[PDB]
């Protein structure tokens, strides 16, 4: 049958000089299987299901580093968005990223995702062609421009067509 | 396995 792997990343800025909270939750077939939370005392990706226990220390270290990088990345993004929409520092805002792969019964990619929402609103999204972006509004147009210029689509498609599919397959192999 | 984001918003 068909399957899917999705990650949800959320960056929420606190109030006052509050460092944002960054969370990342991974799902397989819409069931949480991994999680990272900045608020935690010892922040790292933790398995949320016993069948993930089989992954060695190297794996857990590597993906934890990814989360570490992502936190900084989102920090830069949040400060940048305040500029795009003319907003004040003290406030509380949320940027969410959703990406992952739907795979068909044939084992091939049904669809790939890489999209963002800011304060509950749609911002920018990678189109089904995995080549073009849909910008929701004015700010999103600035981003799209940069990502088109940068050739960002190719980077994310490479992941969606390769590693994303393979990892999903590897995770399924457990159960 | 999660993916590193590159180009900022």
């Amino acid at each position, epitope marked *: 049958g068909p399957h899917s792997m999705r990650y949800y990343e959320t960056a929420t800025s606190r109030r006052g000089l509050g460092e944002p909270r960054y969370t990342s939750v991974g799902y397989v077939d819409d069931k949480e299987f991994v999680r990272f939370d900045s608020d935690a005392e010892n922040p790292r990706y933790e398995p949320q299901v016993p069948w993930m226990e089989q992954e060695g220390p190297e794996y857990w270290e*590597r993906i934890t*580093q*990814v989360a*570490k*990088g*992502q*936190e*900084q*990345w*989102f*920090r*830069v993004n949040l*400060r*940048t968005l305040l*500029g795009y929409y003319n907003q004040s520092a003290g406030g509380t805002h949320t940027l969410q990223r959703m990406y992952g792969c739907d795979v068909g019964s044939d084992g091939r990619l049904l669809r790939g995702y890489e999209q963002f929402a800011y304060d509950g609103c749609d911002y920018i999204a990678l189109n089904e062609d995995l080549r073009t972006w849909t910008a929701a509004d004015m700010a999103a147009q*600035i981003t799209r*421009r*940069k990502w088109e*210029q*940068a050739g960002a689509a190719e980077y994310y498609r490479a992941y969606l067509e390769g590693e994303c599919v393979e990892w999903l397959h590897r995770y399924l192999k457990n159960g | 396995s999660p993916l*590193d*984001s*590159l*180009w*900022w918003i």
Partner: T-cell receptor
Amino acid sequence: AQSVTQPDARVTVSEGASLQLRCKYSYSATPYLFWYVQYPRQGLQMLLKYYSGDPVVQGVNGFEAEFSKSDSSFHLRKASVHWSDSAVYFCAVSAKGTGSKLSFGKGAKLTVSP
Amino acid sequence: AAVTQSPRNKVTVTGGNVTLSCRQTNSHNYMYWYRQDTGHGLRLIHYSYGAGNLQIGDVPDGYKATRTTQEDFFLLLELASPSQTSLYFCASSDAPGQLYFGEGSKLTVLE
């Protein structure tokens, strides 16, 4: 702490010869690695980029670098250099996610004798 | 690289006030100011991750910087000293460690 070490400030090779430019870095986390090139009277520009996955990355004109996690190295190489390759080459290491954690090497001035 | 510095050439006397302009119209997030000297490679002076933000580099002494807008990053030399005779580069960045360099501003401070 974060740093990049290139051993030789100056390098001369004959046109047609092979090239290796060495680079060592010190950084506690998993980095992005780059080679930049600065042609005479210009600014720097990206030549090679490493994000993750395959340790060997490739660039224009037969340039490539190899990431070695065990040695903390990112040596550059090219099978056959030409006069137009005469330039200053900079190795660079960056933290992921931010732009606030980037370090350039001292650079290596390559002279290719025609 | 859509990065343009101005002026490209500048000569001033010790004590003078010098302002270098850097504009990048691609609205990159990060901007940097470097100086380049024989035997010291490229040295970071100041950088910024957005309008209104300023972060000191490795050799900030004698320099101020201002990110008035997402596109504009000025470098200011308040009481120009001969030691600031150098080649200055501005750079923008749209991804971690990925920089696009200006064409350079050559400055000499006369004593």
